[PDB]
Design a binder for this molecule. Structure first.
Ligand code: WB3
Ligand code: MG
Lengths: 556, 414
């Protein structure tokens, strides 16, 4: 007998106040009972479970289920009640590595550790809560009562405790063998190195030797599956990675779950297939939640989808990360609030790709969106590589400098350089900081009757130019914008505009270059055509003449 | 120190469960070194998956120093930790501090590590050193001793600290000492020369009576802190535009000050005049201007600090590296206003300047009232939240919200 170290127990509690499960065992057929008795007798011999007396008052139902070609029965202990009552754990497997962060390894071997799983003991004070009962034949004897000694499959804590237990066991081996990497995914351990095949298998042997100190028998994962590993939706090849094949179904009638799966696939594909777009397809499913409703395709979705198919025609792959090389991120504007990017170390060999879509909102501009794309990539790059990439942006250095020095908010973009890749991001208008000498001054105003929805918008100028337009189905705020719009329409290339509209100022000072309000869009289009616009604000109802004059003209 | 102090969360409140945000490789490496030593010294221990709580952690370089410092973001645990009256119904915040001619700030947080933490509360101080790209399990730890940044640490340590200070205090009856979180504020009216020596006299005391960053001093002169009253221009020729801006600013001021009038000034804007036309002021408009100017000199009336209410700090980017700010509890009742320029290190970095402005304003707030304000930051949340930790140099962290629509009022503190 070679002494083995015990695996340290994780202490476990139920959620505060709650007691353990007490769920009735269902009746079972004579055949299922016999099956369960044999299964449980075996597991009992293996130490997995123990027979208990009648004093334990907890219970969890057990079931017997058959499989198709394996004419075996299998047991299922339904721990759903127990899981509802079990404390929360730290789930160390939340984050999945992204393949583009991984480092190329000359050699990787796989080890089955599912057998080591049953060496992890369950906290003795908790075992009582795992009791279950095999009903007896013809219910003429007391049911056989058992509780777990090991982490039960299907129990809330088993993944976290099993993974924590292995990690602690592995820690000294990893720390003292820095030339290898070890990764656990479910019942398998992956060990990679850049050692030659001979020196690699000795590290494997040494690791087996280390595991045997806790009595863990670990042979090679039987039926060694040739590369690539199929893992978390990816293909991990030795020198490249990609998403598992993406095939977009040919359809005549597209329903709302057809497109959720389609945008899911496209989103998943976009981490490596450059230029994927999903705005038009995503737009088609705003409010519906009946997963069977068929939606007609906008011709802009058919165009977008067909574009996606062209991108998906050939498989593409990403390279793994080399920490000795630089990290570079390149962004292109695609239109309609859509942005796409590539991250690479040497040109034409992407580590990964991705996309960004504009936030919901009434007014927006390209610079803000580019800035948001940059922050998204920055953060994703911190996650994957622990550092910020250098950016290549389709915005001239002077555009950016003008934007951020005049923008009312603090803003910042990390180290970057211009790349001349149209369409370029630009400022479409720049308001004046001072009134323009010799430009006509327009005093604008608008007003609407909240009941009738009838309004008026217009202006008066220092040259005696005047206009009032009657409007139907409008609001104070819309008439205030309409008045500014009229002044832009009716003035020369340079104009001073005086308004009392805090609403219109709030919008225009936000510097949008596009809007969901068509009137705001018309205003932007006028601003682009001007040479100089100075927009001045004054408070309403203060006897500011010109303002006062047109206020009366529009108030009916 | 062997005896623990019983501490509990507020009723019906679990411990914090805050996600660790992603960290750069260099900050991760710094934390691994720091926590390895802390672990050797007993300050923290590894924890198991049966602990589900988490508080974010990161690393900073304090002002003008080489070594990384661990900084735990205990804002969530602080608000969940019971209110404290450790041995006393409360310390009066010293109104004397803001009047001293010089205040030096000491990082005394290392002293907390000599007091053990209540064994039942330790679980709630759990934190995670993340790995890059989730490649290895995060390193999980909890505190065994009073942690830096935690609200309870100065509270529990306050008995032990009053005694260390006692010989120094009864020696210097006119030296004002205030403790806020991990900081010690030490104010004297004497001039420079004596200060660094007296502060070092205070430093030695803690070494004799007991540190990585204890050697440093942050020097402040609150007696020279300048307020920003509201100013009206003085001009010999007023354009229509000038008068319009003036009437706007005065109409905004009339919400703060009684008896501002703009009738006579508005009367000059009669007709529909070109913006650049010079309007001579009538004497009755000049009188009105003079009266308003007089009103604006005096303080705002009915302005009182209410310790039950939050302090609110608004900040405006004015361009060219200038920032204005106002601290208040009720709108239009400013308790303090200010302006900053020439934020060193950041002439081409908005967010770095904003981060330093936030730290200077918080420092002013601790000194004047003994607490931190809730900020209204002129920045998009995603920009701020990506970058501020790169420029953070204080051992506390205030709360903040974001302003997305441009205030008209930036104009009237220019
Ligand atoms: C070791 C490991 C395996 C998996 C598998 C999942 C499944 N199912 C997943 C991860 C995350 C993982 O952990 C880490 N992986 C890596 N790099 C990867 C890069 C891709 N290759 C693919 C490959 C190469 C060679 C062969 S071969 C011998 O020719 O047959 C066959 C396949 C494996 C190693 N670097 C790491 N660095 C630091 C820490 C951990 C790292
Ligand atoms: Mg009006």
């Amino acid at each position: 007998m070679v002494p083995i170290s015990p695996i340290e127990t994780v202490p476990v509690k139920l959620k505060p106040g709650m007691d353990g499960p007490k769920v009735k065992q269902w009746p079972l057929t004579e055949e299922k009972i016999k099956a369960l008795v044999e299964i449980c007798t075996e597991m009992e011999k293996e130490g997995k479970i123990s027979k208990i007396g009648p004093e334990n008052p907890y219970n969890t139902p057990v079931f017997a289920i058959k499989k198709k070609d394996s004419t075996k029965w299998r047991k299922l202990v339904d721990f759903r009640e127990l899981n509802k009552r079990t404390q929360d754990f730290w789930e160390v497997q939340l984050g999945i590595p992204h393949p583009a962060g991984l480092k190329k390894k000359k050699s990787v071997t796989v080890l089955d550790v599912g057998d080591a799983y049953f060496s992890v003991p369950l906290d003795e004070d908790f075992r009582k809560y795992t009791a279950f009962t095999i009903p007896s034949i013809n219910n003429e004897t007391p049911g056989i009562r058992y509780q777990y000694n090991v982490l039960p499959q299907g129990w809330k804590g088993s993944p976290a405790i099993f993974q924590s237990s292995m990690t602690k066991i592995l820690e000294p081996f990893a720390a003292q063998n820095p030339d290898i990497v070890i990764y656990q995914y479910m019942d398998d351990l992956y060990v990679g190195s850049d050692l030659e095949i001979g020196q690699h298998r000795t590290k494997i042997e040494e690791l087996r030797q280390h595991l045997l100190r806790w009595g863990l028998t670990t042979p090679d994962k039987k039926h060694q599956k040739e590369p690539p590993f199929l893992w978390m939706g990816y293909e991990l090849h030795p020198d490249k990675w990609t998403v598992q094949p993406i095939v977009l179904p040919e359809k005549d009638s597209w329903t709302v779950n057809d497109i959720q799966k389609l945008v899911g696939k496209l989103n998943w594909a976009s981490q490596i297939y450059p230029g994927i777009k999903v705005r038009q397809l995503s737009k088609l499913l705003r409010g519906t939640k009946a997963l069977t409703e068929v939606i007609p395709l906008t011709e802009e979705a058919e165009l977008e989808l067909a574009e996606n198919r062209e991108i998906l025609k050939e498989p593409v792959h990403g390279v793994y990360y080399d920490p000795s090389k630089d990290l570079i991120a390149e962004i292109q504007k695609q239109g309609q609030g859509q942005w796409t990017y590539q991250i690479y170390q040497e040109p034409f060999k992407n580590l990964k790709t991705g996309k960004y879509a504009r936030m919901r909102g009434a007014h927006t501009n390209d610079v803000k969106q580019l800035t948001e794309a940059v922050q998204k990539i920055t953060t994703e790059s911190i996650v994957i590589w622990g550092k910020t990439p250098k950016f290549k942006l389709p915005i001239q250095k002077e555009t950016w400098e003008t934007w951020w020095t005049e923008y009312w908010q603090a803003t910042w973009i990390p180290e970057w350089e211009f790349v001349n890749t149209p369409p370029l991001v630009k400022l479409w208008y720049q308001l004046e900081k001072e009134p323009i000498v010799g430009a006509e001054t327009f005093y604008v105003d608008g007003a609407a009757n909240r009941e009738t929805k009838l309004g008026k918008a217009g202006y008066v100028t220092n040259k005696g130019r005047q206009k009032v337009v009657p409007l139907t189905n409008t609001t104070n705020q819309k008439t205030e914008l309409q008045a500014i719009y009229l002044a832009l329409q009716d003035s020369g290339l340079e104009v001073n505009i005086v308004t009392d509209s805090q609403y219109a100022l709030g919008i225009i000072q936000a510097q949008p270059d596009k809007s969901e309000s068509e009137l705001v869009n018309q205003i932007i289009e006028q601003l682009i055509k001007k040479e100089k616009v100075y927009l001045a604000w004054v408070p309403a109802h203060k006897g500011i003449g010109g303002n006062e004059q047109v206020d009366k003209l529009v108030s009916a | 120190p062997i005896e623990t102090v019983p501490v509990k969360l507020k009723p019906g409140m679990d411990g914090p469960k805050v996600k660790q945000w992603p960290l750069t490789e260099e900050k991760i490496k710094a934390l691994v070194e720091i926590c390895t030593e802390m672990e050797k010294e007993g300050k923290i221990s590894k924890i198991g998956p049966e602990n589900p709580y988490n508080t974010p952690v990161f690393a900073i370089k304090k002002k003008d120093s080489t070594k990384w410092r661990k900084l735990v973001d205990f804002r969530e645990l602080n608000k969940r930790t019971q209110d404290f009256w450790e041995v006393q119904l409360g310390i009066p915040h010293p109104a004397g501090l803001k009047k001293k001619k010089s205040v030096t700030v000491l990082d005394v947080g290392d002293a907390y590590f000599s007091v053990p933490l209540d064994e039942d509360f330790r679980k709630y101080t759990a934190f995670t050193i993340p790995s890059i790209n989730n490649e290895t399990p995060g390193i999980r730890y909890q505190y065994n001793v009073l942690p830096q940044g935690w609200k309870g640490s100065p509270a529990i340590f306050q008995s032990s600290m009053t005694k260390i200070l006692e010989p120094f205090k009864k020696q210097n009856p006119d030296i004002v000492i205030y403790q806020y979180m991990d900081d010690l504020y030490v104010g004297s009216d004497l001039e420079i020369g004596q200060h660094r020596t007296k502060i070092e006299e205070l430093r030695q005391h803690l070494l004799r009576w007991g540190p990585p960053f204890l050697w440093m001093g942050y020097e402040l002169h609150p007696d020279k802190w300048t307020v920003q009253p509201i100013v009206l221009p003085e001009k010999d020729s007023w354009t229509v535009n000038d008068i319009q801006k003036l009437v706007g600013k005065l109409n905004w001021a009339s919400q703060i000050y009684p008896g501002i009038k703009v009738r006579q000034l508005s009367k000059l804007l009669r007709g529909t005049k070109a913006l650049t036309e010079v309007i001579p002021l009538t004497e009755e408009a000049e009188l009105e201007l003079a009266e308003n100017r007089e009103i604006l000199k005096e303080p705002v009336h009915g302005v009182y600090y209410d310790p039950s209410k939050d302090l609110i700090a608004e900040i405006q980017k004015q361009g060219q590296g200038q920032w204005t700010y106002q601290i208040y509890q009720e709108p239009f009742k400013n308790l303090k206003t200010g302006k900053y320029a020439r934020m060193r290190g950041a002439h081409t970095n908005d967010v770095k300047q904003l981060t330093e402005a936030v730290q200077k304003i918080t420092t002013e707030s601790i000194v004047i009232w003994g607490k931190t304000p809730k900020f209204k930051l002129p920045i998009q949340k995603e920009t701020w939240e990506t970058w501020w930790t790169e420029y953070w140099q204080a051992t506390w962290i205030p709360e903040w919200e974001f302003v997305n629509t441009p205030p008209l009022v930036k104009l009237w503190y220019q």
